[PDB]
Amino acid sequence: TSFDVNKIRKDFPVLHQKINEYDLVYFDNAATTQKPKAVIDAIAQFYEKDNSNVHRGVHALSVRATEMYEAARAKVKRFINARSPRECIFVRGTTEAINLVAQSLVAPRILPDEEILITHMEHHSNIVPWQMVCKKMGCKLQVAPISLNGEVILEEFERKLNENTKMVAINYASNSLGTINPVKTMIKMAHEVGAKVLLDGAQATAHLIVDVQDLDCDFYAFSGHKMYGPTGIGVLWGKEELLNSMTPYQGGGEMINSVSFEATEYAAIPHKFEAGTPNIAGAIGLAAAIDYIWSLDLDAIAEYETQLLNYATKAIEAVKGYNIIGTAANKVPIISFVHGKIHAHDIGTILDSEGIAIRSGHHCTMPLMDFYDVAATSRISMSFYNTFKEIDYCMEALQRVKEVFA
Amino acid sequence: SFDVNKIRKDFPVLHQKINEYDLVYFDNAATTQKPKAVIDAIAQFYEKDNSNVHRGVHALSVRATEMYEAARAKVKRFINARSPRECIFVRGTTEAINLVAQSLVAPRILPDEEILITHMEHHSNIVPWQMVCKKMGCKLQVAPISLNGEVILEEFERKLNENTKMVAINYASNSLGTINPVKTMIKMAHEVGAKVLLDGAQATAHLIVDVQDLDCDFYAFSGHKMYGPTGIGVLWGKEELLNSMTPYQGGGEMINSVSFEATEYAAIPHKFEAGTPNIAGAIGLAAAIDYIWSLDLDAIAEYETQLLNYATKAIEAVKGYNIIGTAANKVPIISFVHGKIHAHDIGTILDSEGIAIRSGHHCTMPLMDFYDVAATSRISMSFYNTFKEIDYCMEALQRVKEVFA
Ligand SMILES: [Zn+2]
Ligand SMILES: [Zn+2]
């Protein structure tokens, strides 16, 4: 490979520690990612130099901080190829973004004879908000099936679309399976029946170039902490005409133009959807994460992460006894797997005893676990700072897990 | 006896110039500055411990989860909650109030039933209730204030009736500085069966919070207004009430089980924390609580009262400026007006001399209407401000008078 992972790993202080006698091997990136020094420093510098509240200020630090905050929004626009920064809303995370759409677009409009369509592989954060709407409003949640290899069955997705489908909310890349779904095609199908389409981009945004104009999604949601940025910050993007037509979500300061006891007038987007003091430092840290990603080049990241995924896929199958769940043709670098006798929890615990961090559980996809007739899977989820040597060590530890239960 | 010179060394942002002038940061009611201990706690988390929390098997996840739940426990101690389970992490006071409006009040309140607030509420303790009134048909009632900036208690009591289901009241005012007699008001509200939320966004930086003694049913505050990071705040509520409320946001982490046939929700507090929480913000907030405790809130209050008294006398001695909000009990905030000079010009010219204040409506437009002004200028102080800073501010305010002589 041409990707200088040894140099890149120097940017991530957390990677250089031991877990008892063992080097940390951080293979839990789908749960959250580690941060480069550039992101940590951007947050610290904000508090050390520029901190003040944003908008409607007169003084120098407030003026500086406000332009830094709106500059972060503009960088988000460039990062996802939005038409305008006013379409880019700062939230806590993907979960809040989806709840905002569910309550501000769908709940005030959907009728009892209408439908919301999702896929079987959704994360709970792209299931529960829609279940809440259906319970209150009487509409039906429909679920498009997947095949055993972890791919959406496109013919059945199309069959579940109809003139009553008003909202389609679909996973871009799966945190459990790794599958990258053909979302541009799925969006085109959904638009043919008149539905609006939200993409859950929590995993995809760390690994692929996001272009919301090319995809033609109506909404796009992602989380900063899953893409090398701080916790507590995420983005809801939506088409301007839709966001304008939606009701506000949370109410209070900053999202109004005027408040009286006789009338309240709301602000224009994006501020319409940012109630109260925003997570100013989180937005600035997210902008630093985007700059960091761009400095590595997303094409270079994707080439290397493909090499990691291919190498680990071949290596875990060569260990013998472990079966991969999720073998789609297009994947982000995630491998879920099971053993026919050894419980997922024991795999994860024993791997951690050798410094290796994975996730063993349902990965917030309990309906997927049900589909695969398993209680849990174990999940290796990699990033561009992981290495072939780490993969080798992980496979040696998985062989020792077999030997514990020989 | 308060060693402000030593404390100021903890706040790196204070040590800079705005053009040729030392920064004088008098905008603490908008947001506060952070001590190195808080900045370092956030950086150290990302440098050493970062991982997602709960349901993890590996060392960093276990460490991060213990740190996150320990932060919740520190919040409990900080406000004297009965249990950490009652303490919910949100983005800020605004989100906390929306959560209660949507999860307690909207699913229960009937048309013509009433929500009672005071005239001095911040917009974040007005708009959520207006949203519920518009959708559910209930009625928003407003308890009046007197010209000195105090709640008129007799009229607050008069506005309470058998149909008052929710009372949401300011603890300390970001615009006036007033500290309201919330323990008495809560007793009055409970006599008619109402639940009471306290907006503690300003009070929590300046007073010892004891939710058990106040007997409020909910308490909301923001980390960034009490020396902590942005993006983190707290909703506290009585356990029995939180258990009876519907969830607010839905998704990962706040469930026990999800299927397409049935979804079972987690117990409090996790019931109300959907998706990955702001883990680093909670840890930074715990560092802010530790820092406040290291100074002692009794000592902070004594010194901040000295600052307020000194600045109140000094600005009245300048002549030409009138204080808005002269309550008997105040946090260290002075809003003021001039009869001819616009607030925007006061704030702009003060900033030209390095002095950071706020000139505007302070998210209390109905208060501005009550006082028949469009805006006020606001000095809002913290324990790292000094008498010399106050002197310089007043000299700058005299120069403003001379600009428009
Ligand atoms: Zn406002
Ligand atoms: Zn979950």
What is the three-state SS of A118-149? EECCCCHHHCHHHHHHHHHHCCEEEEECECCC
> B297 — contact with chain A (CB < 8 Å)?
no
CA–CA dist A241, A206 (Å, integer): 27
| Answer CATH for B37-295 from 3.40.50.720, 3.40.30.10, 3.40.640.10, 2.40.400.10 | 3.40.640.10
Q: How far is CA A391 from the centre of its chain?
A: 24
Which tokens sit at B31?
A: 């947001």
Helices and strands per DSSP (H, E), number in chain A = 14, 17
CA–CA dist B199, B220 (Å, integer): 5
CA–CA dist B374, B335 (Å, integer): 13
> A99 — contact with chain B (CB < 8 Å)?
yes
Nearest Cα to Cα of residue B325 among B146, B123, B154: B146
Nearest Cα to Cα of residue A225 among A235, A240, A236: A235
CB-CB neighbours of A163 under 10 Å: 10
> A254 — contact with chain B (CB < 8 Å)?
yes
Looking at the CA of B360, name the nearest ligand.
1
Q: Give B244: exposed, middle or buried? Use CB within 10 Å, 0-12, 13-18, 19+.
A: exposed
Residues after which chain A is broken (C–N above 2.5 A) are none
CA–CA dist A357, A370 (Å, integer): 25
Which tokens sit at A384?
A: 């561009």
Q: Are strands B263-265 and A356-357 parallel, antiparallel or unpaired?
A: unpaired
B286: left (phi over 0), alpha (psi -120 to 50) or beta: alpha
SS3 state of residue A110:
coil
CA–CA dist B105, B99 (Å, integer): 9
Nearest Cα to Cα of residue A142 among A151, A150, A134: A134
SS3 state of residue B149:
coil
Gyration radius from chain A CA atoms: 22
Cβ pair B222, B194 in contact under 8 A: no
Strand (E) or helix (H) holding B298: helix B297-318
Under DSSP, the state recorded for B326 is -
Name the β-bridge partners of B338.
B321
CA–CA dist B326, B150 (Å, integer): 8
Residue showing tokens 């959560």: B99
Mutation target vs A (from B249, B273, B349, B363; most A CBs, 10 A cutoff): B249
Cis peptide before B269 (omega within 30 of 0): yes
Q: Are strands B139-143 and B333-338 parallel, antiparallel or unpaired?
A: unpaired
CA–CA dist A43, A36 (Å, integer): 11
Q: Domain residues of chain B, as ranges?
A: 2-36+296-400, 37-295
Cβ pair B29, A52 in contact under 8 A: no
Looking at the CA of A251, name the nearest ligand.
1
Which tokens sit at B362?
A: 């302070």
Residue showing tokens 């307690």: B104
Residue showing tokens 């600009």: B403
CA–CA dist B23, B393 (Å, integer): 11
SS3 state of residue B273:
coil
CA–CA dist B358, B360 (Å, integer): 6
Nearest Cα to Cα of residue A82 among A269, A245, A304, A274: A269
Q: Torsions phi, psi of B89, nearest 5?
A: -85, 130
Residues of chain B in contact with residue A102, where contact means CB-CB under 8 angstroms, are 250
Q: Which residues contact B395 (CB under 8 A, 6 or more apart)?
A: none
> A399 — contact with chain B (CB < 8 Å)?
no
Residues of chain A in contact with residue B197, where contact means CB-CB under 8 angstroms, are none
Measured between CB atoms, which of B224, B255, B279 is closest to A128? B255
Under DSSP, the state recorded for B172 is B
Q: Which residues contact B217 (CB under 8 A, 6 or more apart)?
A: B195, B196, B197, B237, B238, B241
CB contact under 8 A, A232 and B91: yes
Q: Torsions phi, psi of A204, nearest 5?
A: -65, -35
CA–CA dist A225, A206 (Å, integer): 10
Q: Give A7: exposed, middle or buried? Use CB within 10 Å, 0-12, 13-18, 19+.
A: exposed
Class of domain A38-296: alpha beta
CB-CB neighbours of A146 under 10 Å: 24
Which amino acid would we find at residue A62? S
Which tokens sit at A298?
A: 């997303």
SS3 state of residue B217:
coil
Name the β-bridge partners of B255.
B265
Residue showing tokens 């009632």: B141
Under DSSP, the state recorded for B3 is -
Q: Calculate the alpha carbon distances from B233 to A355, B53, B79, B88, B95 in Å.
A: 34, 18, 13, 8, 8
Which amino acid would we find at residue A198? L
Which amino acid would we find at residue B361? H
Cβ pair B80, B210 in contact under 8 A: yes
Q: In what order do the strands lie in the sheet with A219-223?
A: A88-91, A234-238, A219-223, A196-200, A165-171, A115-119, A140-144
Q: Are strands A356-357 and A25-26 parallel, antiparallel or unpaired?
A: parallel
Identify each DSSP E strand in A241-333 by its residue range: 256-259, 264-266, 322-325
Q: Residue A250: closest CA among chain B residues belongs to which residue?
A: B98
Note the residue count of chain B. 405
Under DSSP, the state recorded for B374 is S
CA–CA dist B282, B333 (Å, integer): 27
Q: Which residues contact A139 (CB under 8 A, 6 or more apart)?
A: A110, A111, A112, A113, A114, A115, A116, A133, A166
CB contact under 8 A, B46 and A62: no
Q: Are strands B139-143 and B87-90 parallel, antiparallel or unpaired?
A: unpaired
Residues of chain A in contact with residue B258, where contact means CB-CB under 8 angstroms, are 124, 127-128, 366-367
Q: Residue A344: closest CA among chain B residues belongs to which residue?
A: B57
Under DSSP, the state recorded for B247 is P
CA–CA dist B376, A159 (Å, integer): 61
Q: Torsions phi, psi of B311, nearest 5?
A: -70, -35
Give the method used. Answer: X-ray
Cβ pair A233, A279 in contact under 8 A: yes
Q: Are strands B218-222 and B195-199 parallel, antiparallel or unpaired?
A: parallel
CA–CA dist B83, B85 (Å, integer): 5
Cβ pair B30, B358 in contact under 8 A: yes
SS3 state of residue A39:
helix
SS3 state of residue A318:
helix
Q: Residue A275: closest CA among chain B residues belongs to which residue?
A: B94
CB-CB neighbours of B150 under 10 Å: 20
Cβ pair A190, A161 in contact under 8 A: yes
Q: Angle CA(B48)–CA(B52)–CA(B56) in degrees, nearest 5?
A: 105
Nearest Cα to Cα of residue B283 among B75, B60, B144, B17: B75
CA–CA dist B197, B166 (Å, integer): 8
CB-CB neighbours of B372 under 10 Å: 7
Q: Torsions phi, psi of B258, nearest 5?
A: -125, 125
Which amino acid would we find at residue B128? P
Counting one residue from chain A and one from chain B, the pairs whose CB atoms sit within 8 A come to 286
Nearest Cα to Cα of residue A99 among B248, B243, B267: B248
Which tokens sit at B167?
A: 């009372």
Under DSSP, the state recorded for B151 is B
Describe the crossing of helices A388-404 and A298-319 by its angle, rounded to 10 degrees: 30
Strand (E) or helix (H) holding B154: helix B153-159
Q: Give A192: exposed, middle or buried? Use CB within 10 Å, 0-12, 13-18, 19+.
A: exposed
Q: Torsions phi, psi of A25, nearest 5?
A: -120, 105
CA–CA dist B178, B162 (Å, integer): 28
Name the β-bridge partners of B216.
none
SS3 state of residue B132:
helix
Cβ pair A204, A104 in contact under 8 A: no
Describe the crossing of helices B36-44 and B279-295 by its angle, rounded to 10 degrees: 150
CA–CA dist A78, B160 (Å, integer): 53
Nearest Cα to Cα of residue A238 among A271, A287, A199: A199
Q: Calculate the alpha carbon distances from A143 to A131, A178, A380, B259, B263 in Å.
A: 12, 19, 27, 11, 15
Cis peptide before A270 (omega within 30 of 0): yes
CA–CA dist B365, B360 (Å, integer): 9
Gyration radius from chain B CA atoms: 22
CB-CB neighbours of B187 under 10 Å: 13
What is the whole-number distance in angstroms between the Cα of residue B363 and the centre of ligand 1? 4
Resolution in angstroms comes to 1.5
CA–CA dist A98, A96 (Å, integer): 5
What is the whole-number distance in angstroms between the Cα of residue B124 and the centre of ligand 1? 8
End-to-end CA distance of chain B: 40
Which tokens sit at A297?
A: 């080049």
CA–CA dist B277, A230 (Å, integer): 11
Name the β-bridge partners of A379.
A336, A359
Measured between CB atoms, which of B58, B61, B250 is closest to A131? B250
Cα dihedral A348, A351, A352, A357 sign: negative
CB contact under 8 A, B57 and A358: yes
Q: Calculate the alpha carbon distances from B16 to A49, A291, B402 in Å.
A: 8, 27, 27
Mutation target vs A (from B16, B26, B276; most A CBs, 10 A cutoff): B276
CA–CA dist B82, A248 (Å, integer): 35
Cα dihedral B199, B205, B211, B215 sign: negative
Which tokens sit at A247?
A: 């009701």
Which amino acid would we find at residue A36? P
Under DSSP, the state recorded for A181 is P
Nearest Cα to Cα of residue A318 among A328, A307, A310, A326: A310
Name the β-bridge partners of B139.
B114
CB-CB neighbours of B297 under 10 Å: 17
Helix extents (H) in A193-278: 212-215, 240-245
CA–CA dist B90, A343 (Å, integer): 35
Helix extents (H) in A138-263: 154-160, 183-192, 212-215, 240-245
